[PDB]
Amino acid sequence: ASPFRLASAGEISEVQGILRTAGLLGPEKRIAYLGVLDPARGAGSEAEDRRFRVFIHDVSGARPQEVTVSVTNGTVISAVELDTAATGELPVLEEEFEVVEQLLATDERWLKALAARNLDVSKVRVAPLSAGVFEYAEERGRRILRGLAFVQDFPEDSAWAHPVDGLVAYVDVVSKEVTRVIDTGVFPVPAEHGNYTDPELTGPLRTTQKPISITQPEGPSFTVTGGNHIEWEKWSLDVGFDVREGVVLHNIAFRDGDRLRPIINRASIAEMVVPYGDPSPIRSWQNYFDTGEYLVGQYANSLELGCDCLGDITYLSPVISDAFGNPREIRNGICMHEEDWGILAKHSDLWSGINYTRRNRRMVISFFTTIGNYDYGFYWYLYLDGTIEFEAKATGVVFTSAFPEGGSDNISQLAPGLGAPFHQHIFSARLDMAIDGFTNRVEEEDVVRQTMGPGNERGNAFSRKRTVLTRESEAVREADARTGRTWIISNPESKNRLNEPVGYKLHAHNQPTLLADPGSSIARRAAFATKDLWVTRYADDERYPTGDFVNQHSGGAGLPSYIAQDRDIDGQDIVVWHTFGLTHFPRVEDWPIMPVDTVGFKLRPEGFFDRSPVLDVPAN
Amino acid sequence: ASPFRLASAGEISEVQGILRTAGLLGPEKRIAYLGVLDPARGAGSEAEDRRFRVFIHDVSGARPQEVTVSVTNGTVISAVELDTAATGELPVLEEEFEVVEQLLATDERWLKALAARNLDVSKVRVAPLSAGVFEYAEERGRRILRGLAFVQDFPEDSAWAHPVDGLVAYVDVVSKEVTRVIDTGVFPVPAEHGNYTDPELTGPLRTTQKPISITQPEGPSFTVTGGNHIEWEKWSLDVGFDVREGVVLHNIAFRDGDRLRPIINRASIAEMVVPYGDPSPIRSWQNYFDTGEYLVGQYANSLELGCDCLGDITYLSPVISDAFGNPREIRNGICMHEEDWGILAKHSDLWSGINYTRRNRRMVISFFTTIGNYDYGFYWYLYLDGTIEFEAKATGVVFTSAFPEGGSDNISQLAPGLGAPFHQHIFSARLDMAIDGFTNRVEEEDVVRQTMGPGNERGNAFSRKRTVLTRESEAVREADARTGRTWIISNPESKNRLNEPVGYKLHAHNQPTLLADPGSSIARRAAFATKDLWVTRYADDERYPTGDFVNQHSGGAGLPSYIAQDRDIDGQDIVVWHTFGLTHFPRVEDWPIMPVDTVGFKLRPEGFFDRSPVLDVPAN
Ligand SMILES: [Cu+2]
Ligand SMILES: [Cu+2]
Numbered sequence A, B: 001a002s003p004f005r006l007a008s009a010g011e012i013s014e015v016q017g018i019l020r021t022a023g024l025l026g027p028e029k030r031i032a033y034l035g036v037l038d039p040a041r042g043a044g045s046e047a048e049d050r051r052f053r054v055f056i057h058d059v060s061g062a063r064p065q066e067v068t069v070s071v072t073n074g075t076v077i078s079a080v081e082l083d084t085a086a087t088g089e090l091p092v093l094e095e096e097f098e099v100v101e102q103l104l105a106t107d108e109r110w111l112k113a114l115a116a117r118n119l120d121v122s123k124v125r126v127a128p129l130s131a132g133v134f135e136y137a138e139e140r141g142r143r144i145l146r147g148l149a150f151v152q153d154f155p156e157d158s159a160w161a162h163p164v165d166g167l168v169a170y171v172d173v174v175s176k177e178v179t180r181v182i183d184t185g186v187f188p189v190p191a192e193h194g195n196y197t198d199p200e201l202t203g204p205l206r207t208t209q210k211p212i213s214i215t216q217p218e219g220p221s222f223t224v225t226g227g228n229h230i231e232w233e234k235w236s237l238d239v240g241f242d243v244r245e246g247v248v249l250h251n252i253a254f255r256d257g258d259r260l261r262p263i264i265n266r267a268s269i270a271e272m273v274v275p276y277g278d279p280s281p282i283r284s285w286q287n288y289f290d291t292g293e294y295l296v297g298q299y300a301n302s303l304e305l306g307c308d309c310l311g312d313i314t315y316l317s318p319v320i321s322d323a324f325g326n327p328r329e330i331r332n333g334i335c336m337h338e339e340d341w342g343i344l345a346k347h348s349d350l351w352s353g354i355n356y357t358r359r360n361r362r363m364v365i366s367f368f369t370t371i372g373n374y375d376y377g378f379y380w381y382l383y384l385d386g387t388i389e390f391e392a393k394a395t396g397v398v399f400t401s402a403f404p405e406g407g408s409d410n411i412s413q414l415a416p417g418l419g420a421p422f423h424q425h426i427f428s429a430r431l432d433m434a435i436d437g438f439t440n441r442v443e444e445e446d447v448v449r450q451t452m453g454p455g456n457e458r459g460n461a462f463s464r465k466r467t468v469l470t471r472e473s474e475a476v477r478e479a480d481a482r483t484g485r486t487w488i489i490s491n492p493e494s495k496n497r498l499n500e501p502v503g504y505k506l507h508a509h510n511q512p513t514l515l516a517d518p519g520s521s522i523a524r525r526a527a528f529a530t531k532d533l534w535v536t537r538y539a540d541d542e543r544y545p546t547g548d549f550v551n552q553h554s555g556g557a558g559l560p561s562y563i564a565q566d567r568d569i570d571g572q573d574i575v576v577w578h579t580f581g582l583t584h585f586p587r588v589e590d591w592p593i594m595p596v597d598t599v600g601f602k603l604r605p606e607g608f609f610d611r612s613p614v615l616d617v618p619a620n
Helices: A009-021 A096-105 A108-116 A521-525 A559-563 B009-021 B094-104 B108-115 B290-294 B521-525 B559-563
Strands: A029-036 A051-058 A065-070 A075-081 A124-130 A144-151 A167-172 A177-183 A213-215 A223-225 A229-232 A235-242 A246-256 A259-275 A287-289 A314-316 A319-321 A327-329 A334-348 A355-371 A374-383 A388-396 A411-415 A418-421 A423-433 A441-449 A462-469 A486-495 A501-508 A533-537 A574-584 A594-605 B029-036 B051-058 B065-070 B075-081 B124-130 B144-151 B167-172 B177-183 B213-215 B223-225 B229-232 B235-242 B246-256 B259-275 B314-316 B319-321 B327-329 B334-348 B355-371 B374-383 B388-396 B411-415 B418-421 B423-433 B441-449 B462-469 B486-495 B501-508 B533-537 B574-584 B594-605
Touching: A009 A029, A009 A051, A009 A065, A009 A075, A009 A319, A009 A327, A029 A235, A029 A319, A096 A108, A096 A124, A096 A144, A096 A167, A096 A177, A108 A167, A108 A177, A124 A287, A229 A355, A235 A334, A235 A355, A246 A355, A246 A374, A259 A374, A259 A388, A334 B355, A334 B374, A334 B388, A334 B594, A355 B334, A374 B334, A388 A423, A388 B334, A423 A594, A441 A574, A486 A574, A501 A574, A533 A559, A574 A594, A594 B334, B009 B029, B009 B051, B009 B065, B009 B075, B009 B319, B009 B327, B029 B235, B029 B319, B094 B124, B094 B144, B094 B167, B094 B177, B108 B167, B108 B177, B229 B355, B235 B334, B235 B355, B246 B355, B246 B374, B259 B290, B259 B374, B259 B388, B290 B355, B374 B594, B388 B423, B423 B594, B441 B574, B486 B574, B501 B574, B533 B559, B574 B594
Parallel strands: none
Antiparallel strands: A029 A051, A051 A065, A065 A075, A124 A144, A144 A167, A167 A177, A213 B213, A223 A229, A229 A235, A235 A246, A246 A259, A259 A287, A259 A423, A314 A334, A319 A327, A334 A355, A355 A374, A374 A388, A388 A594, A411 A418, A423 A574, A441 A462, A441 A486, A486 A501, A501 A594, A533 A574, B029 B051, B051 B065, B065 B075, B124 B144, B144 B167, B167 B177, B223 B229, B229 B235, B235 B246, B246 B259, B259 B423, B314 B334, B319 B327, B334 B355, B355 B374, B374 B388, B388 B594, B411 B418, B423 B574, B441 B462, B441 B486, B486 B501, B501 B594, B533 B574
8 A cells, every 4th residue: 555554564575585585684693673664755756665674694704785675576675794893783683682691690700890890690691782883993893792790589570779889891792602711800780679669669659649530532533544654734745664763754744725735845854862970980881772682663562451551542563583494473562642732823913802722732742761761751742733743652661780988970879889871862853844845944043142233222132043054064963052053944936925945944952962082982873862953865875863773883984974975955855854852860769670861852833824724623 | 728829818817917917008008019038947847837939009199118027926027118229029910911902992193193194093002011210200119011002993892803003002000191292204004814713714613633641530630738738649749829920839849758858849931921022112111020020820720620620639729919919719720630641761681581661640730820811821840750840831922013115134024014022931940849858059060071992092081060059150151052051959968879869850942041141121121030049048038030010120139139149059058040931933823822832840869769769650
């Protein structure tokens, strides 16, 4: 049906077959990533060729491959062997997660370290963490996973309460060997438990909360057709799902009277990094690209009604591939519903005697994922007035360490002897713009203060200025909250009735960007995170701000590389990449399980419509 | 009962009786302001003494008076005659608003101006606006209102669609004289109507919105006691209402275990200014202090159940004084309800096998006001996790002008020939802090980036720094979004279990502050709006950042004068004044009636609790 429909169990099985019949999917081969490719640029691309891209790992130690197959024509379009030392390692496999603990359990250096701390090896959990790229030359080409230890007193115990500081291991997950064990010294292992379900810690549960019932006696106002095509209050879009990016929104458009007007061609969180700011050798290499290295989509939770999504919910259960090419359904992995959003517009006019009030609503499309200790909710909102917004909610259990005797400038104390290293959660929203079509342009808008004098004798005047970003080399922008800086995406060939180019304005939260020293490895590998806004010319192979293979990749890939092309972006098919994140100095209130904190951004119509697009909402 | 109870109709009538008995309220007197005073700093004190402050205007031109009476004792505590040219005029009286159009209707300069535009005087509405302080020496000591004209084509017509540019008049509302009529030249009067209720403009209404039903089968979770004392999910507070400030929150405290811990003694929006940025002499004087000059509480709407406040709502109907001292109730002027607030905390742990999800909710206290073309909603939120937040929602109809033929740097076009002068809506939240009691201090916290090198070899480390504000002279602070600047209010004598002073962190939106030139009249009159945060030592007569009398009052009172005392604020009874606002460049989507835009701030606990305060929230 729609070329944007979600991948089917069958298409996944077919990809598996094709790889097999083609001799690419053997018993020692593993699927590290598989996902459908979006239709190519073609107004009315009639001939539908449903293609899938796969990253195939080899447990034997053979070079991995990137393959594109056509499920429609049962063929292999391309198969390329990869030089990981050059282009980066493949995403971490879920099955490689246990390997770190298993290997270490029989390692003399490891066991020695645990014995010095009087820790029973059978009680020691090891977090399989990405390694990044540091001074260890022997790691280039090898797929390494570093390990940090946490003690689990019993099966249902929260190990995060018991970090084992002063100890870290590096493991080659293919040759299956412990490349190194570093013990900088014994630190007391925090004793208090962090079991948020233990009545002893929670105390008597509240009996004060009365129920809040949210129902829709006539069902929801949105319609879902073709499995994932949404139609709601003038909005139209397709909800896709990718194992790496998670929920992806396609063809976001608004039916302005007679015309279905495009706004955004593709919206997604194309990367998400969590850099740690603790200079201890035990953790200074710590930077998790949850999206790039771990693939947040595969870890999406199966949501539960009433608990995760309240109200009249319509679920999508996306299908993904397992390590062998078998389709796997994420039951109730995506929630879709509309929720009341207070007052939309209101005016009580003395002169006319008319008292007017209208209520707002927002269509919500979300999923929640769990990556080790973190849990993140990704929410996309479409409002009645044309506003588009994204919100990330960060929860989970904070990553712990020992709290140094004498305090720390880079770690905060959560409990006796329990520390929580400073870090950030930085996202990159990739917005493939289509403001009334693909001919777009971006302008940076700053508030302009004016000096009192001739033409402004009362010194009350203030204005605004707009600078068009014409080439990619001038499209790497930073925030300026002081001057109310925003960025407007417009279509210079499409004017509203007042003869001004239609547009949408991006309002950022202006949170701090990547704090790491500019010459650091993380500054190089996640260069996108050092600036708030990037604008590039669209290209079918420029999908992530960090490149295709993030794991153990040297640096400079992605955005810094794309931008180097210096293409024309003034009235062209362009893409906006917005960096936004949370800078977390964990507080006592974040322990033992943290309350949700949030970050996001939104885009509001700016001369897109000819008047308010909500004059037709009834009183109700 | 509680000394924080809302004023009763009887109390207001009694204040009238007391003033009458004292010879302070004869027939020529009018009550420009009347409000109950908060109990003095003296826990409990020597029994109940309900005191009311009143500003008494005299329609015959006699000097007005500021009076304080003890309604309990039937006495006048103090009464002083005011020299308005020095200390400021009293707030505008509702009755004076109509006087402007009435007088101008028979003024020959006005009639000549209208005749020059072929406008029927019976169809010309005049917006009666505050005058401010400029170069008109004859205005000093006089109560002046300025008038801008708008044509109303028929009874139910929206006059805002038809501004009459190039014309402004100044009126003395006491002597009833038109002091000046300035006509700078004719401008076409925009012809399109802005009738958002006219099917010709709205088009057929949508039939697509299905109902969203929000109910509470067992009633709300909060209890209302003593008329205005609220108890909800560990929170405790008193909801007061003042005609100038509107909703005021008293004694915000959190019951942590067995102890009721104070957080904020008093929270209110102590001032709000709307400065215009169009240098045309027709509007360059335009600045309203809705709170200080007009008294926003006085114009609170009666909220309709179902459209203004959805769900299980508990209303308060505050009582205020009319111009003669008679009590007037604002029926259903305050809404109170609790709303579901998505996910509170969530974690699916691999190692323990425990999947945990908890739902969030917030207590909401709000009111909506209308002053001319603007409608503002004031919302206070209390969350389960201890977070406190305020949100202002700006809607209504934009203030219009003609759109200059050759375009404008200070006005945007909304419809053919219809302009919307640039302006800001800036608020001042006065937070009389009581973090675990009155001994508090404020620290400015900035993120601190670190250089790669010795002790930070990988260049990944990042920290934070806190600077205590010790004296008022160093407590006028500005935002710094780039460095994640926040302000923490702590109690240096109350430490959490980790031996750190308990605290709350203020997170600002970092929006632009006052844009006007520093040498302008408005920069001096609204000095508070030029900086993001001020901290003062508490004083019972330091209530508003702009002083007691804002109307036609120059600089000389308010925050800049208080700060000069340079009092000790390091571990003392202190007050935080936060400036936050919206910079509005009207867009076509804001016409004919604007969709709600918002701004606010929040405070989150920072080591206030010994662990998460929501561990006792049940699963459902
Ligand atoms: Cu965090
Ligand atoms: Cu405005």
